[PDB]
Design a protein around this ligand. Structure first.
Ligand SMILES: *Cc1c(COP(=O)(O)O)cnc(C)c1O
Ligand SMILES: *Cc1c(COP(=O)(O)O)cnc(C)c1O
Lengths: 401, 401
């Protein structure tokens, strides 16, 4: 009936552009630094051992495929909160939080956005760091909220614009919403240091802002689950009742299984139950109940001492590899006689690194070196291996010489 | 804080209540007729054999857990469209359809609803049959659409108000959206006969309405996948470009794995691509990408001749047990000396049956017999077994005599 003749072709994904060209390249020396998931030293996808084991365990138990409660798997949501807040957290012990399973971090972010749109009467403004993960915009926008921003990244030093951040935040109308990356800021890799987080907390507290933490790399950033959750935990201790989204896509390599959760810190256990009833109401008409596989896998790992223990080592190996690559990249640039300051590379944390390379330098690296990345100078450290770090150091040097 | 002080407790779920009250029951003869999923003759959850086999196949291959494209697993989307439309369908063969993996049937319905709120400029109204599955309301409402209704179920006859439907649909504003249950109407079990479907197709065509099919029971209703998709296929052949949602929850017993899909029938292959593009932009900010497990299983079964073969036998087996229970319930009621007309029980299709019972009687059944069901007189036939059917009939006789 020509119902859709007016539907226009959506704009193409740039990252997709990068991956495709990479795919077309025949030079065996090509590098894909546009990659969004972890890759091993051999440039291959990695399913943790503990994951294989957990999977085998489920298979062994001949479990049913019955619908999970709207809120998800209790063993999973509980373990998830404990993971984030800490076993001895006051918030945890008193049971004054409500955690619901979501469709990975994304779905959890969205549920949260929809929850705020509905019940957070104080404001519609959500302040994002400049820049932020691309998907954050439309998540909040689609949810019916308004987007604001605070200075974060400093192009000058490829570090944190602590001054701008603090000035921006100090002017945020009371009771507004501020989004913070728990650790391993995406896409810059620039995170505040402890002393800086202590200061941001003080202002967020003072200005009575609702803090929304996006925690997609717990344990994957520094290889330590406690350290990665430090800032989130610190806010809550200072009396800031945050909202939070967790993803296991990276830390457990559950990517496609979509395991994640949304958590609200409440005043007491009673209030938590009320909030939880409302989240159930929101979710039902969204997708009814959550996918079971990823949650079943995560819960087993988290709740099985042997698995959990093994997980920590594994997540640590992942973190270590990335760090080692940052280290080696810096070292090789020196060996190459790069007069430039590449400290930011080692100061940066996680999978993403804002290099400082200009659009033109990027082109050259692509055109001449078969090294693929986006024009923002952002590199996925996951695409770097022991075998090519040398080459990359080399190539970067040539275009910056 | 005190951000949530004003968030109040949500309304208690009924279906939820019967289940729990059911559990808290000691009568060894107790029955739960509120169950929303298939149960075998022993009252146990049933995981399909073909499903266990697909899983063993996946396990053996040691697959990665890498993100699926936004639109989901291609083998899955295609197989899915093929299942629905049929192998020789012109719509299928020409590629003038677009299918995206959704979070089962509900997430597919939601994506579909969000898509219409966005691009279906012709109207904001969605007409649901009277009555419709509970979830249908908030799905559309939350999507930003307006709900309307059309007469469907005839309480006087516990059958279809064909005349009422026809007059309602004939008076629906042109270019409005009309939701139709493909087969095994939930919650009444009342479906139009092939002949009535022809007539409905005609009015829908003439009024130029956008028909949105909800197909959650393909193969599960009659034991025949082709017969179950008859009405869908018929509309399409008549030149009605429908939109459709599929669930593999019931027909494959994939309940918690959440495998489903949303389909749009377009003018051409070209339009389908434009449409797909926009569906991707919509889904990204919802949940990023879909759960991989259920889609992997479903894809294996549909694409592997031997598994697909076994699947058809098992669905048939499920459908037959339900039909048998309907049959036995009626025979037992007669035998018991019941003078009431219970033909509706056998005329109805699927797992849900509108008994016609009255509240006070439902109450009686619960109180005196330990038979749990919702006060709407609806019973899940899945809860009936060969070993309790006699009990149920006896009880129903008693409260109705
Ligand atoms: C990974 C990521 C998410 C969520 O990803 P999922 O695959 O949906 O779990 C959210 N925020 C950031 C910053 C991320 O990097
Ligand atoms: C089962 C059902 C759905 C979707 O169920 P899911 O669990 O989300 O797949 C949609 N419509 C009707 C009428 C249903 O019975």
């Amino acid at each position: 009936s020509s119902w859709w003749s007016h539907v226009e072709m959506g704009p193409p994904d740039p990252i997709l552009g990068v991956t495709e060209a990479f795919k077309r390249d025949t030079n065996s020396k090509k590098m894909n630094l546009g990659v969004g998931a972890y890759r091993d030293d051999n440039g291959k996808p990695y399913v943790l051992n503990c994951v294989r084991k957990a999977e085998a365990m489920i298979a062994a138990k001949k479990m049913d495929k019955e619908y999970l409660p709207i809120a998800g798997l209790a063993d999973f949501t509980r373990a998830s909160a404990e993971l984030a807040l800490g076993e001895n957290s006051e918030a945890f012990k008193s049971g004054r939080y409500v955690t619901v399973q979501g469709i990975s971090g994304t779905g959890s972010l969205r549920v949260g956005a929809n929850f705020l749109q509905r019940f957070f009467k104080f404001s519609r403004d959500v302040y994002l760091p400049k820049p932020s993960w691309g998907n954050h915009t439309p998540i909040f926008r689609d949810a019916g909220l308004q987007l604001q921003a605070y200075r974060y990244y400093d192009p000058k030093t490829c570090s944190l614009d602590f001054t701008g951040a603090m000035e921006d935040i100090s002017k945020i109308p009371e009771k507004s919403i501020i989004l913070l990356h728990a650790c391993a800021h995406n896409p810059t890799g620039v995170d505040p240091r402890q002393e800086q987080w202590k200061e941001l907390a003080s202002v967020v507290k003072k200005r009575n802002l609702l803090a929304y933490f996006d925690m997609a790399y717990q344990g994957f950033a520094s290889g330590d689950i406690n350290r990665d959750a430090w800032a989130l935990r610190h806010f809550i201790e200072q009396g800031i009742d945050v909202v939070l989204s967790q993803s296991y896509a990276k830390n457990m390599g559950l990517y496609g299984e979509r395991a994640g959760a949304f958590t609200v810190i409440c005043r007491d256990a009673e209030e938590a139950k009320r909030v939880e009833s409302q989240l159930k109401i929101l979710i039902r008409p969204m997708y009814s109940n959550p996918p079971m596989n990823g949650a079943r896998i995560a819960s087993l790992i988290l709740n099985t001492p042997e698995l959990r223990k093994e997980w920590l080592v594994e997540v640590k190996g992942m973190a270590d590899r990335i760090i080692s690559m940052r280290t080696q990249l810096v070292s090789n640039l020196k060996k190459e006689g790069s007069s430039h300051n590449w400290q930011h590379i080692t100061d940066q944390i996680g999978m993403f690194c804002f290099t400082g390379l200009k659009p033109e330098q990027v082109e050259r690296l692509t055109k001449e070196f078969s090294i693929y990345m986006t024009k923002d100078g952002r590199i996925s450290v996951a695409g770097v291996a022991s075998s090519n770090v040398g080459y990359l150091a080399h190539a970067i040097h040539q275009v910056t010489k």
